[PDB]
Design a protein around this ligand. Structure first.
Ligand SMILES: Nc1ncnc2c1ncn2[C@@H]1O[C@H](CSCC[C@H](N)C(=O)O)[C@@H](O)[C@H]1O
Ligand SMILES: Nc1ncnc2c1ncn2[C@@H]1O[C@H](CSCC[C@H](N)C(=O)O)[C@@H](O)[C@H]1O
Lengths: 239, 239
């Protein structure tokens, strides 16, 4: 029962992944658990402020360390009571390591994650220094909040958990091949005949050549780092 | 009034960005409009089918998406949009980044196609899709989260949505650490430059932090940065 806790000002945003699709069916079947913790539930004052003006001047607001520390402690206690051995705290940040398939595969082995979602101009650095084990970025772009990155990370993990993908792009270092389904003819374009109903073996051959050629056309640096089985090497030299 | 149309089996997911945060305030203020089109409203009610050649999973059918995309196109024309590309979210697309995001701001609006399951029929892409974009080298269970990532990244750079000049990747460097109250957190002080500094030495410190952080974490990005003479002077004043 993989345990996910997200520290977020907008818990309702996570309904996008707990209430729909394959990730929703996983939450509803209790294969995973998603608990949302709002730092405003650990803030002081009638307004429950979690943000304040940055030292050194500058626009915007910075999330205060003290409510987030309390929210992370609560999340740590929730995970311990859930039977988890250890759950690392991940901060979503453009300054973290870049999520890719290799990272996803490692995350699948974890008992669970606590994911910290920032807002405003970001989170006080001392909070990161003391409470965060890992920083991950979903890409070289800036979003208005860490909730969507958290959801991207969570979704990428949930779909590889047992009882929730062998042909995934990047799983073998190559891109997936073009897919075709009914109708037989679409706006003058037909399915390649090899795929239509030939035997099991020759369809598999075509799929590899398509993965390699597509990977070659779009992402040639991945061809540099790919390792081929002997059956695949045979197919290439034939062309 | 930028126009967004998303083709998605799960329109409710997009509440995550239209109802919360800065992107939500933009939708409520009518600075942007997001319209969801469900391919199930255009089927004869199946929208996915088994792939030719066998293989696991389902492939989204071209004909409902063609009808949905055309409806999206007429929706966009009736909104007055001149230039609206059809974008398909796919890990086989070009990788989104901040430079790409800036280019999207130039469009009158977007039609974004969200695939599910094993993906979208290849021929539908060939005939109806102008651009393919990936948010990263990992596989998600659907294109809705990537669509939202793209939309959020665009929305936060639109006029009337101050504090975006200091973003990561804006100048090719990562952002510097942020601090706010209290003066001391669990033994850690705010750097004194930020506490009691002034315009020149704070600006110097922030730049040296951006540079050093980029060098430690993303050393390839230093290759692609061009420095003002004042920044070049600041660096040499250290080394
Ligand atoms: N590409 C991305 N990957 C992961 N988290 C991201 C992200 N873009 C924004 N976020 C998170 O969204 C929140 C608000 S944006 C703050 C951005 C920060 N000044 C910077 O450029 O480093 C932060 O917690 C930030 O880490
Ligand atoms: N990194 C990413 N960027 C953009 N769209 C993505 C994505 N990961 C998944 N999607 C979209 O999510 C949907 C279901 S995932 C299908 C993935 C496909 N087998 C492949 O390996 O290429 C598809 O429409 C896909 O384009």
């Amino acid at each position: 029962h993989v345990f996910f806790a997200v520290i977020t000002l907008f818990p309702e945003m996570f309904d996008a992944i707990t209430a729909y699709g394959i990730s929703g069916r996983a939450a509803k079947r209790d294969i995973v658990q998603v608990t949302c913790i709002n730092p405003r539930d650990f803030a002081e004052g009638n307004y429950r402020r979690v943000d304040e003006r940055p030292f050194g001047g500058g626009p915007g607001m910075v999330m205060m360390a003290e409510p987030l520390a309390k929210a992370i402690n609560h999340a740590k206690q929730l995970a311990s009571r859930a039977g988890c051995v250890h759950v690392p705290v991940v901060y979503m940040s453009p300054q973290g390591k870049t999520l890719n398939e290799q990272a996803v595969q490692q995350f699948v082995d974890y008992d669970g994650l606590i994911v910290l979602c920032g807002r405003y101009e970001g989170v006080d650095e001392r909070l990161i220094q003391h409470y965060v084990d890992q920083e991950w970025s979903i890409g070289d772009y800036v979003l208005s909040g860490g909730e969507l990155p958290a959801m991207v990370l969570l979704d990428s993990i949930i779909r590889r958990l047992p009882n929730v993908a062998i042909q995934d792009s990047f799983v073998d270092g190559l891109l997936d091949c073009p897919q075709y389904t009914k109708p037989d003819q679409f706006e003058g374009l037909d399915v390649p005949e090899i795929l239509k109903s030939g035997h099991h073996a020759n369809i598999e051959k075509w799929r590899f050549l398509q993965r390699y050629q597509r990977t070659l056309e779009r992402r040639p640096e991945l061809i540099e780092q790919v390792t081929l089985t002997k059956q695949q090497k045979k197919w290439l030299s034939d062309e």
